[PDB]
Design a protein around this ligand. Structure first.
Ligand SMILES: NC1=N[C@@]2(c3ccns3)CN(c3ncc(F)cn3)C[C@H]2CS1
Length: 391
């Protein structure tokens, strides 16, 4: 298998906890900024005023190509908020397609818990659809603009590379965190076959989960529960997030599978780290997790299987040690299933907008051990899969 997109391979940096970012330029002359890649939102928004956690920001007064749209945008969400001023400017991705487009840009003037101390990113690239753009769906998202203005195919693909150990801020700076291939699929980034699930509706990247197993044991819930009230693929979320009742059932099953060791409640709640002596993490006591997704062919599904090497997120010890430490990166949701960064780290994920489908293949960079690997397998005969979708 040949890799046909060398210019874009290794263009991401970062990690699941703080997010993965790509270098972009905005304005004339070009202003370089690092931008978080978020498949869970649809606005392109950049720091545009001094902030304690920003080393640089977009300076509209220094761009000859800046256009003021004379309109504010206010974006509150669960864990934070940003607000700013809408405009347009010329935008490029240096390690991307060799094109420059005129895009909507939200210039962020005020924010709360948006910029992370030491993340290295200064803005967000929302790659989902117009339906969820703010202030409304008339604000064309970046990827829409790029496709409309250029010959770039209406597809992108993400390989998010977890290190399997903690990285400090300077280690992130020096390290490759993955690839965003704009307009194509690079065959070097995966092994085995790509399997595709339909995009149910074009707003978030919404999919349908039809079965869940823990170490091969069916969680045995009504499949609507898995998709209540939606299931999405979201690079801007760290964890695998599951609806409350699914979370409760899954955690019970994961506890039962790992019962040779007892972990505190704070671990299972995603709050508290666990630590083992260097090199002794007991991967084998933790179960694999399989999610079965609706296939493209009538009555067919396929499964993606992740390891504890995906769902245990490496963190630095709260005190200086050589221990290997992790947090549990599965958590409860009241807004549906979110297949976040820790699950995307297992897989090369193809966002095939042109054919309204999402592809999954085992990542060439996934963390594993000598005994088990992540997997994408099928087909399976699965009936009444449309009934799994929530209305
Ligand atoms: N995938 C994610 N993305 C976000 C962020 C990720 C990192 N910093 S904020 C952005 N975000 C958002 N953005 C626009 C909007 F209209 C609604 N919500 C939700 C927030 C957490 S979950």
């Amino acid at each position: 298998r040949r890799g046909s997109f060398v210019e874009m391979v290794d263009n991401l940096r970062g990690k699941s906890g703080q997010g993965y970012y790509v270098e972009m330029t905005v304005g004339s002359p070009p202003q370089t900024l690092n931008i978080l890649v978020d498949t869970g939102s649809s606005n392109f928004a950049v720091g545009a005023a001094p902030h304690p956690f920003l080393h640089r920001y977009y300076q509209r007064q220094l761009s000859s190509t800046y256009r003021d749209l004379r309109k504010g945008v206010y974006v509150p969400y669960t864990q934070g908020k940003w607000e700013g001023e809408l405009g347009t400017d010329l935008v490029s991705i240096p390690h991307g397609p060799n094109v420059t487009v005129r895009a909507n840009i939200a210039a962020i003037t005020e924010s709360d818990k948006f910029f992370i101390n030491g993340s290295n990113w200064e803005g967000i690239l929302g790659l989902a659809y117009a339906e969820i753009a703010r202030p409304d769906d008339s604000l064309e998202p970046f990827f829409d603009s790029l496709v409309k203005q250029t010959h770039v195919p209406n597809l992108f693909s993400l390989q998010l590379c977890g290190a399997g150990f903690p990285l400090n801020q300077s280690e992130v700076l020096a390290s490759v965190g993955g690839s965003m291939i704009i307009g194509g699929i690079d065959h070097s980034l995966y092994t085995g076959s790509l399997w595709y699930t339909p995009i149910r509706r074009e707003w978030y990247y919404e999919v349908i989960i039809v079965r869940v197993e823990i170490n091969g044991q069916d969680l045995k819930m009504d499949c609507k529960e898995y998709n209540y009230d939606k299931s999405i693929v979201d690079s801007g979320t760290t964890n695998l997030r599951l609806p409350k009742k699914v979370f409760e059932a899954a955690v019970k099953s994961i506890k039962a599978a790992s019962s040779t060791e007892k972990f505190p409640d704070g671990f299972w709640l995603g709050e508290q780290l666990v630590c083992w002596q260097a090199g002794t993490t007991p991967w084998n006591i933790f179960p694999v997790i399989s999610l079965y997704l609706m296939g493209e062919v009538t009555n067919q599904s396929f499964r993606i299987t992740i390891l504890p090497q995906q769902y245990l997120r490496p963190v630095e010890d709260v005190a200086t040690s050589q221990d290997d430490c992790y947090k549990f990166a599965i958590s409860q949701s009241s807004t549906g299933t979110v297949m976040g960064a820790v699950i995307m780290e297992g897989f090369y994920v193809v966002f095939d907008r042109a054919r309204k489908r999402i592809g999954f293949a085992v990542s060439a960079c996934h963390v594993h051990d000598e005994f088990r690997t992540a997997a994408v397998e099928g087909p399976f005969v699965t009936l009444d899969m449309e009934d799994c979708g929530y209305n």
